[PDB]
């Protein structure tokens, strides 16, 4: 039970220079942790024996440093395929704590989301529910706010959100909030505005429609 | 090499296989570890192949029970009533990761989705490269497989992850595409194929007698 | 430096003893991480790999002495490799295995350095002759082949033709005897071998014991000391995962003190770690305790003091 | 009497260390019953309550040094309270908490008694300067602020303006060092601070160690001794429920002997018990063992001999 603190929680960095990380322990484990490369949708992949030593041809860029609590992982030759949720894990104390996740992301520039709201379908109105989907597409970073306005009423608790992973192509993200209402509260209002606050947007863009409009 | 066969995906409201293969058994220690979805890694336990030496986690000694099958190189971790699971060897390291075994803690029944899309032909109001997307709603279990016009439209495809309802544990996905406004005589059919319920959904959306 | 210049030699061997599993000595001690824990302090670590020990299928025993030829071939290969890495001027860190390999470990060491001294740290004396044994397991019999005073008392065991006795009885020191045969106690009193059993340790304190040991060995002449070390000589609270756990053994602190004093001699020349059986841990945590204990012992043989170390530059910068 | 006249000061504080839970030091040590166990033998027990430590929200760290201002305010409040209860002529029993509070504990004690001596019993030296730390957790850094010889080596950490170094390097004694940073070992060898690490304890025996300690401190002059005590300095078999358990520590018997000798000096002036974390017991029985250990240590600091005590009247009546 030694808490491993990964001081970069998440991180975004370009294909480029060094990307040194840190797993700071709670005690002096004295050069007794490891390093992992859990790619998305993958089992984790071990990188380092004991703050060093490059296990089994893991290629050229995963040097570490020890002695004796501040344990680092340098990414010297960044190699942008290496963007994965990293983990440190102690060895010589029980029970075997891991890190938390040290997500390396792609840095490009801040992009505005192409915002696309969608009415609930008449098929969904033929189901008795109503889910309003407002897209945020091809933007950077994940730092976004979706605010629902139902005849200009700031609502919450009726919306579920979904984040894409960062694209290999254009390094963007794609969001949607699914403002799921009943059929009755849907019919009570028309103006269904999606206030989108994102860094690529200079103003909080309210993407709106009316009930029975399109 | 040290290669593993794990089994398998299950839904429970519970044994997990980990078949050792490609090497000499009783040389490396079966070490179970889980990962909650979207979370870190939670170590579980280490059993020897010589004997069932438990040394479980403090928190996992009740729910998780590791057993040994030292004759046929599989080993088993059993459970009583929400994450993905892994078996690794080389207890000081962790280099010999298994497949990945998702178990859901679920009470939902197997159902096909109810897609409530919008696929307008990029003529909503005035925008050239306007979007469209399907609303893959109320399916169980994971996953759905969505393809646009039998996978024809591949650019602009943005499959969103299955956000899980607090309603009936019927998760929700949505896949969207951005065509152009000079594509008005082109329908775009998301082909949602929820295979564990064997349901195949094809969609499109028209206008409402516009100008 | 002169000290902490290490050749590491594994020896995954088990045929000198019954309980299979001490072949996973080198596997475990390397996978727990030993080379790594050496290389922070200025340890010129050079592994030489585990030795490819053969398998004679028709290992026809002697009367009581079981599996003689495989052990003889094993220690011959080991004696060659250990003498080879002492030609490199390193410190022959050997780990096994069992005590039967210490025959070759001290034999090849004596090939290079004939004037050595042995500190045999074990719960047992391991001085069974092939006549005086009862098990005939050869980890009970390494010492009898190396004492020159038992020449003539040693039958020509098949596989040990290359063996020559190398030390005298007045150059070996036992520390931590607590399980001794009648034959072993008879020979030990017969040869006048200086020993510090647990009686004398409880009498004197481990500081006084180590001081008398180094006065008994190095008080005449500076000579390369070959510490060889059983892990069962410690009390099995600290090392449960070993072959012959005998209660009332040495504590962890005392063994650390032994190793620190032997390092501060600076005449350490070859270190042997035997009898590590990971298959005897009732939990893998027990194995973890035994292995971390043995690794801490080995690290304390190479400068890692409990008072700590520092690389000799100003840290106030 | 002069001795066993106690001010008890709790300090439910944790911000010098990462693992939250050592705030339940005073809660547990009072709920286990400590005041009560004092009051049978003639202990003028006066609690002074747990100190109301504030919460600075914008505790902006230094580079490595984390949470400086809350720790500085905490030790300042503690130094005021400890000097206040030494104005009462009592013995400042302080319990926390962590070693960061020992700054104020020895500071306020030195305000009243400038000629004190520190016996810093801990598995660690805690002599990290803000330059030489790696964690920056301030329980690794109390001693650097109190040494006059590190003046100039101490950057002006925000919150520690009131701090003045108070003791010399030749007046502090370590007992039980077994986990020392390279910077810590470098400074410890640099200042010539007399220490008794586990090496010297295993060499000498705890009787000889305590005798040399009291000869080193009081052999020149009778002066008030401030024993400050970590519970991880004991072996973690006896004290598992603490922050940095380091194996191969002091046994329970040896710690009791230390405390009994310090009582028989009669120059005990201020006692500090730190690093008790009940949240680190894997079972509450482990917490029970740690707390009963620490309570027995404290009681043996106030006359409770293992040979026993008697009130000086004839019991044959
Ligand atoms: Mn032995
Ligand atoms: Mn301490």
Numbering used by the authors:
A (entry chain H): 1 to 214
B (entry chain F): 1 to 13, 18 to 85, 91 to 220
C (entry chain B), D (entry chain C): 3 to 319
Paper text:
MAb4 binds directly over the opening to the active site, thereby sterically blocking the hArg1 active site similar to what is seen with mAbs 1-3. Here, Arg28 on the LC CDR-1 loop (orange in Fig. 4c) inserts into and occludes the active site of hArg1, resulting in total inhibition.
Human Arginase 1 (hArg1) is a metalloenzyme that catalyzes the hydrolysis of l-arginine to l-ornithine and urea, and modulates T-cell-mediated immune response. hArg1 is a trimeric metalloenzyme in which each monomer is ~35 kDa in size with an extended, narrow active site ~15 Å deep that is terminated by two catalytic manganese (Mn) ions 3.3 Å apart. Here we report the cryo-electron microscopy structures of potent and inhibitory anti-hArg antibodies bound to hArg1 which form distinct macromolecular complexes that are greater than 650 kDa. With local resolutions of 3.5 Å or better we unambiguously mapped epitopes and paratopes for all five antibodies and determined that the antibodies act through orthosteric and allosteric mechanisms.
